[PDB]
Amino acid sequence: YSRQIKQVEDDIQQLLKKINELTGIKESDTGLAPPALWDLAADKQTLQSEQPLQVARCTKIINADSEDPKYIINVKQFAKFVVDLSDQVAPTDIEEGMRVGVDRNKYQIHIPLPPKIDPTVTMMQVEEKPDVTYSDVGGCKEQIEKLREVVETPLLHPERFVNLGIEPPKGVLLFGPPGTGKTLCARAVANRTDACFIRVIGSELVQKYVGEGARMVRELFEMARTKKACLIFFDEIDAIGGARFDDGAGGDNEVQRTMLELINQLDGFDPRGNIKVLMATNRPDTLDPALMRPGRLDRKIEFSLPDLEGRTHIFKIHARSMSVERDIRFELLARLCPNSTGAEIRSVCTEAGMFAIRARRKIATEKDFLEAVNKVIKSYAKFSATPRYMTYN
Amino acid sequence: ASKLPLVTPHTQCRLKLLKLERIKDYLLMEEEFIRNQEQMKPLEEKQEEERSKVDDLRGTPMSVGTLEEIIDDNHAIVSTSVGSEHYVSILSFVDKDLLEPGCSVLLNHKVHAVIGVLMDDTDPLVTVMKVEKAPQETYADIGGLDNQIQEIKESVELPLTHPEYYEEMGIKPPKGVILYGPPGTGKTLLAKAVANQTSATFLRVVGSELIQKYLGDGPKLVRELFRVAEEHAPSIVFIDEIDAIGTKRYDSNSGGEREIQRTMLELLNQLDGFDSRGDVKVIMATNRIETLDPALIRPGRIDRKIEFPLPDEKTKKRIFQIHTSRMTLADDVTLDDLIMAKDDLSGADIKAICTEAGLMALRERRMKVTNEDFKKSKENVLYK
Amino acid sequence: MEEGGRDKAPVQPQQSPAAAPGGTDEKPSGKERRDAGDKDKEQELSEEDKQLQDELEMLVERLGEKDTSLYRPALEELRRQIRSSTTSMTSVPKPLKFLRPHYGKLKEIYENMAPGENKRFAADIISVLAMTMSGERECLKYRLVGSQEELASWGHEYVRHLAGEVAKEWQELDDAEKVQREPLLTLVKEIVPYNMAHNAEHEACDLLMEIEQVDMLEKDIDENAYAKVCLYLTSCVNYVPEPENSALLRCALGVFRKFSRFPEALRLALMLNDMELVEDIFTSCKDVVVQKQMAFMLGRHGVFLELSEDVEEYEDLTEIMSNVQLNSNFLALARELDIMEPKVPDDIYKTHLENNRFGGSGSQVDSARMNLASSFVNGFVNAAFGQDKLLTDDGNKWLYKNKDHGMLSAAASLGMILLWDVDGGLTQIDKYLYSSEDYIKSGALLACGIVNSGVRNECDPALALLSDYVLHNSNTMRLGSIFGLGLAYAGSNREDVLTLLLPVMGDSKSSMEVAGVTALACGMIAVGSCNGDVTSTILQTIMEKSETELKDTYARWLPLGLGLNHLGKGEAIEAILAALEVVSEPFRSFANTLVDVCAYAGSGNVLKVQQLLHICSEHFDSKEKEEDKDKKEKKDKDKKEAPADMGAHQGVAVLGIALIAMGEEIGAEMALRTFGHLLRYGEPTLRRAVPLALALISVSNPRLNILDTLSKFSHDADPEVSYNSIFAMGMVGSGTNNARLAAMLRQLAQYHAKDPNNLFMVRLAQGLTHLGKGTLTLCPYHSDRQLMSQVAVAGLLTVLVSFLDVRNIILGKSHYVLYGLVAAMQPRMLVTFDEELRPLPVSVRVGQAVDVVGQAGKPKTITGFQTHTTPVLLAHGERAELATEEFLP
Amino acid sequence: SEYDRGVNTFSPEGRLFQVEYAIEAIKLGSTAIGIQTSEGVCLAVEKRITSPLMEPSSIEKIVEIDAHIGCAMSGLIADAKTLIDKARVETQNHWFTYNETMTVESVTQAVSNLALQFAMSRPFGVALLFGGVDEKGPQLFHMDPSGTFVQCDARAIGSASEGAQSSLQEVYHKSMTLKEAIKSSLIILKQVMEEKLNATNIELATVQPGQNFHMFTKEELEEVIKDI
Amino acid sequence: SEVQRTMLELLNQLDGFEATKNIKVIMATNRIDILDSALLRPGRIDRKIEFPPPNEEARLDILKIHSRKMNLTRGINLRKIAELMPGASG
């Protein structure tokens, strides 16, 4: 029966592997889907892609003209010339900085004109929220509430602000200890939001050429203002601009232009309006004062290292999953690691679990947590990344 | 594909016989209905003649376009190779699922409508960055250490071979691992050994070639490096000699240490990207660890730090037995004298000594080594 | 290689047996002692399962075949002395000595005669000498003998004793893993007469081990998932005494009683309810047993406890069964109101604020049908015990503005408000019973029905208010006068008020819409094996519907009154008793596709599956039987709701490759209705597959069907990322899918998820997977939901209030004697392990742990930690008493 | 940069940050508890032993300032050694000049005067708790590395100081006897020590109006441990 | 010094990670004391070879192999010409 186990199943599962393949006769795509669903509309609704609709390639509007339409059209570089396109739409949708689907001989209007932007910024929207909440971020509760009344009630009911006649704050900086802090609560913010959440990492804005970063900042602000309200996240603004310190030969101008132009874009001359932005960095002392101006940096969320209560709370947060002999001494563990950061604490619980699974155990003990903490905080104490960065220098 | 997962019974049982009979009967009615669909409704034949009509509707050449935007309703703007973009239609059979911006698409030659998507013809640097075959001997080849071996098996090999222990632990395996120590102790080889052992896809590039001749190309380079790392498999990525990026300056770079700092901030983002990372594991190796920025070394970005000490003499004799195993040695030689022949010797040193002794024996066409071969080997190899 | 010299066993056990004429004759010392030495050497060395090439099991037999061909198949002078010491070497390595068709001659070596017993020298074996021997014997020899004549001379009684001893062998060799092979071998022998082996093994497993009554138990239930026709019937009914005789668990008696009641007989779990009255052990588990007895899957049990009002704690047992003992309503006022749920959230409608500035100008929606959706805006959110004090004013003035059907709609949506609040809800509905509009008054009568759905109150306020309207002169109060009453009195299957609504079929008035929904309401109380309901419908069908068979209002509701409630019972004679008298004309044989599967809720009947498919797949019938092929596929969505999660995989496989792949009007109109019932949690397979046919509406069909495909796509679990797609469906739904026919439909889809963002169970997977109700209200909802103007004028009678048989969502609770404990629980993923090892975890996702109520959801098997000494049921069902003590936790 | 911590740099806003770093560094030491009652003053420290090799007698924190004043130790012990030596010699020369015993406030003010003086280049990583009796009765003074000395009736310093201070707020009042105060202090010490209480796991001292500086109640404290 | 860094990535590529044999690297340079310590691990470089300035015999031989290809005259005594130059280079 045991060595004879392999005599019943094979006789039917090999036959299964025959008929499933025999049904699987719509495959080998290399640029297709199952053609019963790919070419599910392989009827005449294929021919109507040909004779009703014709090419209608892209175009670019240049200038208007008086009375009868006679607008001027760029293709991309092909030719630069003046026609009247057609008459199936009222001549009020034509504004400079727009793209119509225009033929080569008839020049049909086809569709109204959408703006053209970089595909990179379209990719740059994340449209995915990480599975982190506002509950599993503990140790920074007053930082939590300070960011709660930045990205909620403007997104929720505005009648309170209208009733008090108060415009909500716009420029908010969130900052904390290096390494532990703003990033994961930013994922929580993106989890709890509803409108778009445009990511910006500061290192990617630098380009091979000069001034392109200004162009993509303009494009991202344009596609943001297509929405009623949309969230902007900024990471590591220290590299995207420190200060204007030029001396002799030009130094780091290529990023300076980008930071100053975004400074021009945030303040003055009909701003974004209903767009909420936020930035987080690693060192705040090196930022430019003009970027530090309120109206772009109104709120100043600063996270510090938790004293004891935040440490106990994060010990609760990461360690509701591992096996223990019921009783714990998490508060004395927190007392054992006074100047310790949150990801360090999660690393401590991780290594405690690793020590438990060393030979055969299934539940870690208090001395296992001791064996975690001593070989984390006071055996890897040589680097620890803290001391030159608690001064942020 | 994706029929049903069930491996629970694996025995002579109705919990297997019942399942197999029901599924084979399900395949039976599937076969009977598909026999229905081309017997009393053959049309012409309806299997490949429809494909033939599509292929006729497909143009003979490929006016290959680049995708830059999407519109849902069976058309979009595509950019031609010459640069004059078009707002062509799509095909019903254009399989509108694997469409992505910046991708090659088969268009018509006359109306240039989106006929289909084009599979990428591989990629240049994925071939360069991917190690093809297993390098050399497995963990039996190191000898002497026997401690960091268990640790790195626990952090890397153990999650793959035993994806059960952490489940009853309810815990996450460690993510980032630094190997450090004096040079020549066996970091990039320990790298070779773990590359041999693993079955996952392996990536390797040294930090020295992370410098580049323009602005932003380094951060961009790291970006699609990790993009290739994510898009293939559960993968292990190995960077060696990271400290070079902070120590050795150059003039080929357009920007100085500033662009280096920008690359550093990008990779600090990349190790702790708030976007969903997944099952990508990270192994580092660097001798001069103190010159690195310590925020790279942090928990959450780096979980383990492993020191590689200078070998002990009882480990030295183990290396002597390991490396001189396959070679023919005469009785006149002694490893014990050569153990303390240098106070400060490395594992590269002994291999270089034995290889030089081999070539010195090859000078006189001799098959076996003698003691004077090592006695003349030591000053040639070490002493200059 | 190394062979020769050390081959002593291929020499001396090769020379002696080859000279079997020289051994048995003229050398009796050799034939006895050398065979005894071969026996006691091989039985210790070559008779344990170590490898294929054993030293005598494979090695000596290379020549040993000619040592075996004439050693003892032919001696012709056999005695007692040469059956213990001559059936001594050749009996052991015979399945590898002989070829595969040794099954016929399996008797000739070992099964001839053992030296006393098989276990005498089978004790040093693992699987081969006796276990494989018994497997082959019961698989083929006992099968062929017991096929027609079990006891001829020998192959029964010795086989009976052999089965008896191997029944203990499956545990004594190792009581860890191959104990589950005892049901394997018990099912292999006498498959159809499984009871004959089951009674043999029953008391043996009862005397086997007290703690071993659980792995064989779950192996039995896994085999009881599906089997042959009589096989599951006998297996479950013999399975029922197992958690009672040896094990004193006795709380799975309810679910086993359910599994044994409807397939086997009618009053089988009624006898088990009597047995529940017998097993008056400690009352916590008793009360938890009767927790299931009304308000989880089935009720109607209020007469079996008042035996001269003598049952101990009768008054508490009745308050539990009745669902009137607010264990989910006090829960409702205490759990989610006090944490996250306000009375007036009202946001998903108000979430439609972002999309107005995409595509240009906004506020283009100016239709009136969208106000119907506004009903659900105060309707769907008001589930789970909210309140709208004059927040139905948008519905109030609209109830004084237009749309008679909309007045009925709002007044019926009021009954969704106060679901299960029988004592407070009547006072809120009272203000409408006094309306000058028949639509508002009828909707208030339907609201009184909805409030009582699944709750048996001693004052009968549904029957007592709705009775006076059942035969009312008009229709608003006449037609809608009865729908709520069946909803109120569905599980409490009371025949007295059923007789009161019987003459509505006998009214013989023009009730083309009304008599159909009367069959819905009567079947809602009772369908299947219903004496008066079957007769009244079939006679009225001949009286009017025989001379006119035109529109689906006629014969899609009277077939629903025949057997939908008794769809669990699969004797199929209710199909015979309901169809064979009405097989007259094709539109009257149109209901035969209903009645055939109206005994086929859930089982394994792939043969009955394929006959509903192959005989009527498409056939190009050209508008005469095509709708009946639609109904057959609409009767293919069931039998797959709980196919041990197995037929769903092939079901979604065949649906993709048949209907939408290459189909017809069958696959173009109601193909996606199977997905509308198949899953209720939502997985990314169909969550992407449906919008392929939904977001691309393909309006060549009467797109309301695709809209109905979009609408019932919201069958999934309430919290999801799926909001964004159906919000993006709102983007395409602004211009396309016009407000004149779809505006109420799309918005209904988003709020289907965000009802009480919880409180959903009609999936028919109760406890772990078990059945109960969940269909008598669900099946009407999609049956009348084709595409056409049925869902607009006549659908609004029901489509708002069709399915209100939801019975909670959450389970993780405490329910102490003080009913306020906060004992530490631990949520975890659904059970994945069936037969792996003794310390198998029940689940895998062990990370997150609360101690207070949360979301049970579909794919979860919350048990909890800390070992709080909760021996009450340990089988889930949300009302564990937690009889706390200290078993050293 | 390194010029930021040159000698004397306050803050972007606020006082000197390096003395604040001494304040956070004082939590990296064994705790101490002190109670001032009219019946007497009680002090208790944790030995914080790591192995049974070294003798607990050499593990010394509590010392005698003079015959009527004692004190504990916290933070860096070698930093405490200089301050204790100077306090002893200033008390002795004050007795020499002034032929009398002083108040605890004079000693506390003197060590506060030395605390700011920068041995230079950093504040001392030590916080002391002076306790004893003088002409006005029992006295207990708390001192910090910033030098701001202050009087306290009950105090807990070192690691885990704030939880012990919270329990002191819970249990301490005015009319507690010396035995009651000692028992409460030992109770709180028991719930804040990570290891089981042993004979040499901790250390206790007391000052009475009648008796002089007590000799650490050695081998008598097992009576007040075993009873509770 | 970019020559040295190229030797870094090449030599760490050819250490077992590659699969195609029969590939080796040759380096020509001067003043070996100036190159980095990275190439100075004895396992990095298999062989290092010095080229001395030519002496009298080497100078004469190089003079011969270059004077092979001109229209000379019978009787030269290139030994004198070689010893005239004090060995500049080859």
Ligand SMILES: Nc1ncnc2c1ncn2[C@@H]1O[C@H](COP(=O)(O)OP(=O)(O)OP(=O)(O)O)[C@@H](O)[C@H]1O
């Ligand atoms: N309040 C908190 N509760 C629990 N974990 C926290 C908390 N704050 C931070 N963490 C931990 O911080 C780690 C990551 O920190 P995060 O990346 O968000 O910080 P940061 O300051 O933005 O730095 P960086 O992005 O450069 O790593 C996570 O492992 C998370 O568990």
Ligand SMILES: Nc1ncnc2c1ncn2[C@@H]1O[C@H](COP(=O)(O)OP(=O)(O)OP(=O)(O)O)[C@@H](O)[C@H]1O
């Ligand atoms: N313990 C050892 N035994 C034998 N050889 C060793 C040992 N450690 C290092 N080596 C030698 O070191 C050389 C390089 O190995 P590896 O790639 O692991 O880097 P490494 O030893 O850290 O030195 P490097 O940084 O100079 O490349 C190999 O030729 C190998 O023989």
